[PDB]
Amino acid sequence: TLIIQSLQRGDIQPWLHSGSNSLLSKLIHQSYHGTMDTVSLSGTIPVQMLLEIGLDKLKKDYISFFIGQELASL
Amino acid sequence: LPSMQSAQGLITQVDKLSEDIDLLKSRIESEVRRDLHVSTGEFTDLKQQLERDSVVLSLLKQLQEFSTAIEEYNCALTEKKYVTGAQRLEEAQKCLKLLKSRKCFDLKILKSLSMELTIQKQNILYHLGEEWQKLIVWKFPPSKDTSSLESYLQTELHLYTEQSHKEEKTPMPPISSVLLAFSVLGELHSKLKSFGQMLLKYILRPLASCPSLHAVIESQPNIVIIRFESIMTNLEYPSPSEVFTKIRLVLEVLQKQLLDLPLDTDLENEKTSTVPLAEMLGDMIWEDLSECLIKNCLVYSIPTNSSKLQQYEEIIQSTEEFENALKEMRFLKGDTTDLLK
Amino acid sequence: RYILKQDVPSSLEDALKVAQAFMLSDDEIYSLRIIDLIDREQGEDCLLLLKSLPPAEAEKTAERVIIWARLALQEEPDHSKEGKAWRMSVAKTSVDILKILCDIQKDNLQKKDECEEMLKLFKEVASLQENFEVFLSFEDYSNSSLVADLREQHIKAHEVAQAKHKPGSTPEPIAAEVRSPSMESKLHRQALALQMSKQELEAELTLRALKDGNIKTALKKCSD
């Protein structure tokens, strides 16, 4: 809800990374294009939105080591 | 800035909250009738709070309607749909009267609501006042004089009849819609007062003073022109029959060209009735017209010799038809006026 | 509206270009500025702004603010001190701007009579509000019944203001070498709005004294 209020008020421009698998990045993108619809938080949706961020974080942390240490490719 | 979508969110949440209030009231009523001796008190104690919440929710519905009507009226202003905008303003006024009738909100909030309502009402009225002057044009001589013959010669009245479909990029709504918009907001009373007085001052009264004046009506398809053309006569005072005919000639065109459009009151209210235009127009000019005709035309038509009394009979007859026509055209209410007595 | 709520000295100029670049009339800008100043009871600023404006947009702002003022006065009167003060300020600020508009519209004959009638109506309303502290709506104002009632009430008041001054008892040590203002002057202050001259006042007093059975006071006034 705080993130929704911050995005609606147009107070910040969050820094983003490529891939944008999390829906929150898409919400930020649509806030860049004006104003978005009110996001509902019901059931396991709030759990899954946060889950979608950790997957990308861990994937980037893994890729920074596999390719960084020349142990694996894309 | 960040609350346009929140307005639709408010609509949805208030709708689902009203549905929740209704379903919970139905649930309470279903169980009250079952246990009427053991569960009545505690059910009613919470139903009181439910009904108070429902009243507050209805007040919030009225606020939402106040916002929605104003927004729809704002949308209608840009597209020049003045009748629907005026009806929405009337709905908002009805909502605001009920909001102010119950002391439940902050005074400054209601002050702001009333201020914005008055701003929008003056906004629509000023547009109506602008648009009134394009359709009806009074062309005056460059002076206030109304005693010289050239003062009447340089007087022109123009009625812009919308015979064909307007192709101008700056369109003008039809006169019937203008009259409907004025009737919805109740401001036709002042505009009729303004227009009938200038009509009396520059059209009606001149015809009863100078016997040489003649009203020429040029009937173009789009512009109807009323003009005064001077034809010299030898009478020191105007005779009654010609003056009555000249008045009737103008009053027929004014009733048919302008006053022959139906009126309609507020859309959501049927407790108000539509009064014919000719009645209101005559009521504000007939009192000052009968005395003008009596004190300028009928006084000097009285013969000074008893031999010429019989020739006055036509004047008795010619007046009666002038009395009858205005009764058929609804410029009068009764049957016997001071002009015939 | 938000910029005009900041009370910045350049806030009027800031809001001017907002409607300029977005293709909106300057009529609304100055109209809302004048309305905001009226709500703050600063009509002198409205006068100086109107005099600084060109007459073309000045007419448009003045007619709209007059319509807004009459519409705002059409709602229910407020019995608080601030409410009645606001009605008085609105009327007093409307009268002189109507005078200025009359000065502007000297040649527009169609607008001339409308403006003169509207000026007369607001002059009567303001005179009745200031001299009597009577606040109602325009439908109640234009009703001749209240005008006649207030005329006869102050005719009767003038009857008593002199009847008590015919000595029914010994005079009091008041107005001794420092004479109080005459009641007739206050009645005439009230009646300047009522448009009652001295002849009509004497005519009414004669009939009222005749109804009371006082013969000499009616005959003396008839002789005068």
PDB file of all heavy atoms in Angstrom, chain C residues 188-210:
ATOM      1  N   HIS C 188     -35.045  60.189   7.306  1.00  0.00           N
ATOM      2  CA  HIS C 188     -34.682  60.499   5.930  1.00  0.00           C
ATOM      3  C   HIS C 188     -33.484  59.696   5.440  1.00  0.00           C
ATOM      4  O   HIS C 188     -33.441  59.345   4.257  1.00  0.00           O
ATOM      5  CB  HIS C 188     -34.399  61.996   5.786  1.00  0.00           C
ATOM      6  CG  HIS C 188     -35.622  62.852   5.899  1.00  0.00           C
ATOM      7  ND1 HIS C 188     -35.571  64.229   5.925  1.00  0.00           N
ATOM      8  CD2 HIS C 188     -36.934  62.524   5.987  1.00  0.00           C
ATOM      9  CE1 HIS C 188     -36.796  64.712   6.028  1.00  0.00           C
ATOM     10  NE2 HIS C 188     -37.641  63.699   6.067  1.00  0.00           N
ATOM     11  N   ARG C 189     -32.522  59.394   6.316  1.00  0.00           N
ATOM     12  CA  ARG C 189     -31.465  58.456   5.954  1.00  0.00           C
ATOM     13  C   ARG C 189     -32.056  57.111   5.557  1.00  0.00           C
ATOM     14  O   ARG C 189     -31.641  56.512   4.557  1.00  0.00           O
ATOM     15  CB  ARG C 189     -30.493  58.267   7.120  1.00  0.00           C
ATOM     16  CG  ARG C 189     -29.566  59.433   7.409  1.00  0.00           C
ATOM     17  CD  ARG C 189     -28.724  59.127   8.642  1.00  0.00           C
ATOM     18  NE  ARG C 189     -27.870  60.242   9.038  1.00  0.00           N
ATOM     19  CZ  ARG C 189     -28.241  61.206   9.873  1.00  0.00           C
ATOM     20  NH1 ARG C 189     -29.454  61.190  10.409  1.00  0.00           N
ATOM     21  NH2 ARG C 189     -27.399  62.182  10.180  1.00  0.00           N
ATOM     22  N   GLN C 190     -33.021  56.624   6.336  1.00  0.00           N
ATOM     23  CA  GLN C 190     -33.686  55.365   6.010  1.00  0.00           C
ATOM     24  C   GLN C 190     -34.491  55.465   4.717  1.00  0.00           C
ATOM     25  O   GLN C 190     -34.498  54.526   3.913  1.00  0.00           O
ATOM     26  CB  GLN C 190     -34.590  54.938   7.165  1.00  0.00           C
ATOM     27  CG  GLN C 190     -33.859  54.686   8.471  1.00  0.00           C
ATOM     28  CD  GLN C 190     -34.804  54.525   9.642  1.00  0.00           C
ATOM     29  OE1 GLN C 190     -36.021  54.635   9.492  1.00  0.00           O
ATOM     30  NE2 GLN C 190     -34.251  54.260  10.820  1.00  0.00           N
ATOM     31  N   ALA C 191     -35.172  56.590   4.504  1.00  0.00           N
ATOM     32  CA  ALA C 191     -36.108  56.756   3.399  1.00  0.00           C
ATOM     33  C   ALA C 191     -35.444  57.168   2.094  1.00  0.00           C
ATOM     34  O   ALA C 191     -36.112  57.158   1.054  1.00  0.00           O
ATOM     35  CB  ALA C 191     -37.181  57.783   3.774  1.00  0.00           C
ATOM     36  N   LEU C 192     -34.164  57.549   2.119  1.00  0.00           N
ATOM     37  CA  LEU C 192     -33.454  57.792   0.867  1.00  0.00           C
ATOM     38  C   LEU C 192     -33.460  56.544  -0.004  1.00  0.00           C
ATOM     39  O   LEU C 192     -33.536  56.632  -1.235  1.00  0.00           O
ATOM     40  CB  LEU C 192     -32.024  58.251   1.152  1.00  0.00           C
ATOM     41  CG  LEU C 192     -31.188  58.672  -0.061  1.00  0.00           C
ATOM     42  CD1 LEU C 192     -31.792  59.896  -0.734  1.00  0.00           C
ATOM     43  CD2 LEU C 192     -29.747  58.937   0.346  1.00  0.00           C
ATOM     44  N   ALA C 193     -33.377  55.369   0.623  1.00  0.00           N
ATOM     45  CA  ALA C 193     -33.614  54.119  -0.088  1.00  0.00           C
ATOM     46  C   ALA C 193     -35.086  53.929  -0.422  1.00  0.00           C
ATOM     47  O   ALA C 193     -35.414  53.393  -1.486  1.00  0.00           O
ATOM     48  CB  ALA C 193     -33.111  52.940   0.744  1.00  0.00           C
ATOM     49  N   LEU C 194     -35.981  54.358   0.468  1.00  0.00           N
ATOM     50  CA  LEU C 194     -37.417  54.233   0.252  1.00  0.00           C
ATOM     51  C   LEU C 194     -37.959  55.250  -0.741  1.00  0.00           C
ATOM     52  O   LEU C 194     -39.124  55.137  -1.139  1.00  0.00           O
ATOM     53  CB  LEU C 194     -38.160  54.371   1.585  1.00  0.00           C
ATOM     54  CG  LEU C 194     -38.018  53.216   2.579  1.00  0.00           C
ATOM     55  CD1 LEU C 194     -38.771  53.519   3.865  1.00  0.00           C
ATOM     56  CD2 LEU C 194     -38.503  51.914   1.964  1.00  0.00           C
ATOM     57  N   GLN C 195     -37.149  56.233  -1.144  1.00  0.00           N
ATOM     58  CA  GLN C 195     -37.545  57.252  -2.118  1.00  0.00           C
ATOM     59  C   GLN C 195     -38.789  58.016  -1.673  1.00  0.00           C
ATOM     60  O   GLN C 195     -39.668  58.318  -2.483  1.00  0.00           O
ATOM     61  CB  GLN C 195     -37.761  56.638  -3.505  1.00  0.00           C
ATOM     62  CG  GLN C 195     -36.498  56.071  -4.134  1.00  0.00           C
ATOM     63  CD  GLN C 195     -36.778  55.304  -5.410  1.00  0.00           C
ATOM     64  OE1 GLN C 195     -37.932  55.056  -5.760  1.00  0.00           O
ATOM     65  NE2 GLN C 195     -35.719  54.922  -6.115  1.00  0.00           N
ATOM     66  N   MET C 196     -38.875  58.334  -0.383  1.00  0.00           N
ATOM     67  CA  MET C 196     -39.994  59.087   0.173  1.00  0.00           C
ATOM     68  C   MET C 196     -39.527  60.510   0.463  1.00  0.00           C
ATOM     69  O   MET C 196     -38.601  60.717   1.254  1.00  0.00           O
ATOM     70  CB  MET C 196     -40.529  58.415   1.436  1.00  0.00           C
ATOM     71  CG  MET C 196     -41.733  59.111   2.047  1.00  0.00           C
ATOM     72  SD  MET C 196     -42.349  58.273   3.520  1.00  0.00           S
ATOM     73  CE  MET C 196     -41.055  58.659   4.695  1.00  0.00           C
ATOM     74  N   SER C 197     -40.169  61.484  -0.176  1.00  0.00           N
ATOM     75  CA  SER C 197     -39.819  62.880   0.027  1.00  0.00           C
ATOM     76  C   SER C 197     -40.549  63.435   1.250  1.00  0.00           C
ATOM     77  O   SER C 197     -41.282  62.730   1.952  1.00  0.00           O
ATOM     78  CB  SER C 197     -40.144  63.695  -1.222  1.00  0.00           C
ATOM     79  OG  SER C 197     -41.544  63.781  -1.427  1.00  0.00           O
ATOM     80  N   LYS C 198     -40.340  64.728   1.508  1.00  0.00           N
ATOM     81  CA  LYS C 198     -40.991  65.368   2.647  1.00  0.00           C
ATOM     82  C   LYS C 198     -42.490  65.527   2.415  1.00  0.00           C
ATOM     83  O   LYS C 198     -43.283  65.429   3.359  1.00  0.00           O
ATOM     84  CB  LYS C 198     -40.333  66.720   2.935  1.00  0.00           C
ATOM     85  CG  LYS C 198     -40.496  67.755   1.831  1.00  0.00           C
ATOM     86  CD  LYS C 198     -39.836  69.074   2.201  1.00  0.00           C
ATOM     87  CE  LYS C 198     -38.319  68.971   2.133  1.00  0.00           C
ATOM     88  NZ  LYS C 198     -37.662  70.288   2.364  1.00  0.00           N
ATOM     89  N   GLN C 199     -42.895  65.771   1.166  1.00  0.00           N
ATOM     90  CA  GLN C 199     -44.312  65.960   0.868  1.00  0.00           C
ATOM     91  C   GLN C 199     -45.108  64.689   1.139  1.00  0.00           C
ATOM     92  O   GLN C 199     -46.186  64.736   1.742  1.00  0.00           O
ATOM     93  CB  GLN C 199     -44.485  66.408  -0.584  1.00  0.00           C
ATOM     94  CG  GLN C 199     -43.912  67.785  -0.880  1.00  0.00           C
ATOM     95  CD  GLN C 199     -44.068  68.180  -2.335  1.00  0.00           C
ATOM     96  OE1 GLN C 199     -44.539  67.395  -3.156  1.00  0.00           O
ATOM     97  NE2 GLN C 199     -43.672  69.405  -2.660  1.00  0.00           N
ATOM     98  N   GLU C 200     -44.590  63.538   0.704  1.00  0.00           N
ATOM     99  CA  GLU C 200     -45.276  62.276   0.964  1.00  0.00           C
ATOM    100  C   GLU C 200     -45.295  61.944   2.450  1.00  0.00           C
ATOM    101  O   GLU C 200     -46.295  61.416   2.953  1.00  0.00           O
ATOM    102  CB  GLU C 200     -44.616  61.147   0.171  1.00  0.00           C
ATOM    103  CG  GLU C 200     -45.018  61.096  -1.298  1.00  0.00           C
ATOM    104  CD  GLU C 200     -44.169  62.000  -2.177  1.00  0.00           C
ATOM    105  OE1 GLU C 200     -43.692  63.044  -1.684  1.00  0.00           O
ATOM    106  OE2 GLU C 200     -43.980  61.662  -3.363  1.00  0.00           O
ATOM    107  N   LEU C 201     -44.206  62.236   3.164  1.00  0.00           N
ATOM    108  CA  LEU C 201     -44.182  62.014   4.606  1.00  0.00           C
ATOM    109  C   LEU C 201     -45.245  62.851   5.308  1.00  0.00           C
ATOM    110  O   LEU C 201     -45.970  62.347   6.174  1.00  0.00           O
ATOM    111  CB  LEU C 201     -42.795  62.333   5.163  1.00  0.00           C
ATOM    112  CG  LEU C 201     -42.642  62.249   6.683  1.00  0.00           C
ATOM    113  CD1 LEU C 201     -42.905  60.834   7.180  1.00  0.00           C
ATOM    114  CD2 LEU C 201     -41.263  62.730   7.111  1.00  0.00           C
ATOM    115  N   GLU C 202     -45.355  64.129   4.942  1.00  0.00           N
ATOM    116  CA  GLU C 202     -46.387  64.984   5.514  1.00  0.00           C
ATOM    117  C   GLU C 202     -47.788  64.527   5.133  1.00  0.00           C
ATOM    118  O   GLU C 202     -48.705  64.629   5.953  1.00  0.00           O
ATOM    119  CB  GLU C 202     -46.173  66.435   5.077  1.00  0.00           C
ATOM    120  CG  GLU C 202     -44.906  67.071   5.632  1.00  0.00           C
ATOM    121  CD  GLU C 202     -45.001  67.364   7.116  1.00  0.00           C
ATOM    122  OE1 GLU C 202     -46.114  67.658   7.595  1.00  0.00           O
ATOM    123  OE2 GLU C 202     -43.959  67.303   7.803  1.00  0.00           O
ATOM    124  N   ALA C 203     -47.971  64.035   3.906  1.00  0.00           N
ATOM    125  CA  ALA C 203     -49.274  63.520   3.493  1.00  0.00           C
ATOM    126  C   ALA C 203     -49.675  62.311   4.330  1.00  0.00           C
ATOM    127  O   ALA C 203     -50.822  62.210   4.781  1.00  0.00           O
ATOM    128  CB  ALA C 203     -49.245  63.162   2.007  1.00  0.00           C
ATOM    129  N   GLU C 204     -48.743  61.381   4.541  1.00  0.00           N
ATOM    130  CA  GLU C 204     -49.040  60.205   5.352  1.00  0.00           C
ATOM    131  C   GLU C 204     -49.287  60.575   6.811  1.00  0.00           C
ATOM    132  O   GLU C 204     -50.198  60.027   7.446  1.00  0.00           O
ATOM    133  CB  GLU C 204     -47.902  59.188   5.245  1.00  0.00           C
ATOM    134  CG  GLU C 204     -47.688  58.647   3.839  1.00  0.00           C
ATOM    135  CD  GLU C 204     -48.868  57.835   3.340  1.00  0.00           C
ATOM    136  OE1 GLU C 204     -49.527  57.169   4.165  1.00  0.00           O
ATOM    137  OE2 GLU C 204     -49.138  57.866   2.121  1.00  0.00           O
ATOM    138  N   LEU C 205     -48.487  61.498   7.355  1.00  0.00           N
ATOM    139  CA  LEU C 205     -48.676  61.919   8.739  1.00  0.00           C
ATOM    140  C   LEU C 205     -50.025  62.595   8.938  1.00  0.00           C
ATOM    141  O   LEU C 205     -50.653  62.422   9.987  1.00  0.00           O
ATOM    142  CB  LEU C 205     -47.544  62.855   9.166  1.00  0.00           C
ATOM    143  CG  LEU C 205     -46.184  62.205   9.428  1.00  0.00           C
ATOM    144  CD1 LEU C 205     -45.106  63.267   9.587  1.00  0.00           C
ATOM    145  CD2 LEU C 205     -46.244  61.310  10.656  1.00  0.00           C
ATOM    146  N   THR C 206     -50.481  63.370   7.951  1.00  0.00           N
ATOM    147  CA  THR C 206     -51.787  64.012   8.057  1.00  0.00           C
ATOM    148  C   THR C 206     -52.904  62.982   8.187  1.00  0.00           C
ATOM    149  O   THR C 206     -53.758  63.096   9.074  1.00  0.00           O
ATOM    150  CB  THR C 206     -52.026  64.910   6.843  1.00  0.00           C
ATOM    151  OG1 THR C 206     -50.889  65.758   6.640  1.00  0.00           O
ATOM    152  CG2 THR C 206     -53.264  65.766   7.042  1.00  0.00           C
ATOM    153  N   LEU C 207     -52.902  61.964   7.325  1.00  0.00           N
ATOM    154  CA  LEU C 207     -53.928  60.929   7.398  1.00  0.00           C
ATOM    155  C   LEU C 207     -53.824  60.135   8.696  1.00  0.00           C
ATOM    156  O   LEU C 207     -54.847  59.810   9.314  1.00  0.00           O
ATOM    157  CB  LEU C 207     -53.823  59.998   6.190  1.00  0.00           C
ATOM    158  CG  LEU C 207     -53.996  60.647   4.815  1.00  0.00           C
ATOM    159  CD1 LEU C 207     -53.707  59.644   3.708  1.00  0.00           C
ATOM    160  CD2 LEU C 207     -55.393  61.229   4.666  1.00  0.00           C
ATOM    161  N   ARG C 208     -52.600  59.810   9.120  1.00  0.00           N
ATOM    162  CA  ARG C 208     -52.430  59.045  10.351  1.00  0.00           C
ATOM    163  C   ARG C 208     -52.906  59.821  11.572  1.00  0.00           C
ATOM    164  O   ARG C 208     -53.526  59.239  12.471  1.00  0.00           O
ATOM    165  CB  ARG C 208     -50.969  58.629  10.508  1.00  0.00           C
ATOM    166  CG  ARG C 208     -50.527  57.570   9.511  1.00  0.00           C
ATOM    167  CD  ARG C 208     -51.210  56.240   9.785  1.00  0.00           C
ATOM    168  NE  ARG C 208     -50.929  55.254   8.744  1.00  0.00           N
ATOM    169  CZ  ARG C 208     -49.908  54.405   8.778  1.00  0.00           C
ATOM    170  NH1 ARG C 208     -49.065  54.418   9.802  1.00  0.00           N
ATOM    171  NH2 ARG C 208     -49.728  53.541   7.788  1.00  0.00           N
ATOM    172  N   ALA C 209     -52.629  61.125  11.629  1.00  0.00           N
ATOM    173  CA  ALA C 209     -53.147  61.952  12.711  1.00  0.00           C
ATOM    174  C   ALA C 209     -54.657  62.123  12.629  1.00  0.00           C
ATOM    175  O   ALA C 209     -55.315  62.202  13.671  1.00  0.00           O
ATOM    176  CB  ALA C 209     -52.465  63.322  12.703  1.00  0.00           C
ATOM    177  N   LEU C 210     -55.215  62.184  11.417  1.00  0.00           N
ATOM    178  CA  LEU C 210     -56.664  62.253  11.272  1.00  0.00           C
ATOM    179  C   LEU C 210     -57.335  60.991  11.802  1.00  0.00           C
ATOM    180  O   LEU C 210     -58.383  61.070  12.450  1.00  0.00           O
ATOM    181  CB  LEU C 210     -57.035  62.481   9.806  1.00  0.00           C
ATOM    182  CG  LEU C 210     -58.488  62.863   9.526  1.00  0.00           C
ATOM    183  CD1 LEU C 210     -58.844  64.164  10.228  1.00  0.00           C
ATOM    184  CD2 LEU C 210     -58.731  62.977   8.030  1.00  0.00           C
TER     185      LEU C 210
END
